[PDB]
Design a protein around this ligand. Structure first.
Ligand SMILES: C=CC(C)(C)OC[C@H]1O[C@H](O[C@@H]2C3=C([C@H](C)CNC(=O)C4CC4)C[C@H](O)[C@]3(C)/C=C3/[C@@H](COC)CC[C@H]3[C@@H](C)[C@H]2O)[C@H](O)[C@@H](O)[C@@H]1O
Ligand SMILES: C=CC(C)(C)OC[C@H]1O[C@H](O[C@@H]2C3=C([C@H](C)CNC(=O)C4CC4)C[C@H](O)[C@]3(C)/C=C3/[C@@H](COC)CC[C@H]3[C@@H](C)[C@H]2O)[C@H](O)[C@@H](O)[C@@H]1O
Ligand SMILES: [Cl-]
Ligand SMILES: [Cl-]
Ligand code: NA
Ligand code: NA
Ligand code: NA
Ligand code: NA
Lengths: 231, 231
């Protein structure tokens, strides 16, 4: 790989610089290089990995949605193949990034993660990137099943090993509920998961750390925001 | 080039789609392909070209400024070569984009542009991209002279052939005044140019078209904003 000649510590340092400069493609490349050094990632390093790729795919998803919207309208004046072609171009790029992330998770990170915090983190990521693949799929069924199984394994571990207000547990439940509502045609499951997650976190807030209070209350607010939209 | 197999009209269509999707790197590549078909660009097509590359280089400049700021602080604890290396990486990418734009202007567009509107537009772009090169240069003098000479030729034509409220004339004067203030160590020239430009546009506003009123009043407001900051 192009990062093979750079020190692991230098890759981490440059990932943090790329984050400050909002250079997320660079940031992802540095963190991919770090993962490929073969050592486990720390808590801080996992966050760098997830933020980098979340921002890269987030821009691709937003662009794909704009183009798909134009395409669907155009099939409601004929203007030729260009809209479809360019949507397909963005879609292929998006799929390539998802495949890259899923490859890192499957080749390096999930196998070696034993602590609940790392294992749930990586399984959530796996569910997230299969979900992004599902959004553009038309073996959609197989991709949806892959996302569900990854989220479900993460859920089983998080409920057994983490308190209800743990930010990773909360963010996993948020995204799994969105999967149910938006992807899997299961709005009732989505609502039930979001409500039980929120309610159980409320009663646990008297154990929540000052250092994670900001993250967890934010995610709790996103759960409430979705419940208000869905009900 | 990679766009050589695509119809000119398809490249223009996809540039407009890329703009709607905020995919400016794609947008620039499509417009570069269009320019390389060898035909002159229309007014609308020139705007697509300039917006695409302005957004690409704008993100590079913002990232370069963040990294340079970190670098300059670090030379006020030693942390090794990484900040300099990554700043150099972004800088080289930025210079490559500027060189690409300047190459398109010099190989295709400036020679064939005879109408005042196209010729002033392209000469302004030439000044702009030399200015972006000057911001990171440490043959800085030669680059600064190249920007000044391009802006000056554009200024001479615009005052001879365009009314004072023409948006291209106004935007050229805005950017040349910023060049004087920020690049060329000539704040008094910057202030004088901005003030005479603003004053002469005010007295011409009774000829300004309804269709260009929005563009010109916007640029006039930017001139006033700079005058307020500078005085
Ligand atoms: C490594 C350095 C950097 C700067 C990149 O870290 C970024 C953040 O990383 C931790 O937050 C993570 C985190 C957040 C929280 C919600 C950000 N909170 C706020 O906006 C509060 C208002 C102030 C969103 C991210 O996408 C990130 C890394 C991702 C996930 C997500 C990861 O699923 C695989 C599960 C939940 C959340 C969990 C993992 C959260 O714990 C820190 O705690 C935060 O301070 C910090 O901003
Ligand atoms: C081709 C399609 C697209 C959508 C890309 O066009 C974009 C714009 O292109 C023309 O505006 C150009 C223009 C603008 C104006 C100021 C945008 N105005 C507003 O925000 C008003 C509040 C509503 C900034 C750009 O960077 C662009 C293309 C660039 C320049 C600049 C080019 O130096 C080489 C000189 C001035 C300005 C001149 C050239 C202006 O005329 C239109 O008139 C605008 O409607 C339109 O938004
Ligand atoms: Cl395409
Ligand atoms: Cl680097
Ligand atoms: Na090493
Ligand atoms: Na077409
Ligand atoms: Na043709
Ligand atoms: Na270092």
């Amino acid at each position: 790989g192009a990062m093979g000649s750079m020190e692991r510590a230098s890759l981490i340092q440059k990932a943090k610089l790329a984050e400050q400069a909002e250079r997320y493609e660079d940031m992802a490349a540095f963190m991919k290089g770090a993962v490929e050094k073969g050592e486990e990632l720390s808590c801080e390093e996992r966050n760098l990995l997830s933020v980098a790729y979340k921002n890269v795919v987030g821009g691709q998803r937003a662009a794909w949605r704009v183009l798909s919207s134009i395409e669907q309208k155009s099939n409601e004046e004929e203007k030729g193949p260009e809209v479809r072609e360019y949507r397909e171009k963005v879609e292929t790029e998006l799929q390539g990034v998802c495949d890259t992330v899923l490859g890192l998770l499957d080749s390096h990170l999930i196998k070696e993660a034993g602590d609940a915090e790392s294992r749930v983190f990586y399984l959530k990521m796996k569910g997230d990137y299969y979900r992004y693949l599902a959004e553009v799929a038309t073996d959609k069924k197989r991709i949806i099943d892959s996302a569900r199984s990854a989220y479900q394994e993460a859920m089983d571990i998080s409920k057994k090993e983490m308190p209800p207000t743990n930010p990773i547990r909360l963010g996993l439940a948020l995204n799994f509920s969105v999967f149910h509502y938006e992807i899997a045609n299961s709005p009732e499951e989505a609502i039930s998961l979001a409500k039980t997650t929120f309610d159980e976190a409320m009663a646990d807030l008297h154990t929540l750390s000052e250092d994670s209070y900001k993250d967890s209350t934010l995610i709790m607010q996103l759960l409430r925001d979705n419940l208000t939209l869905w009900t």
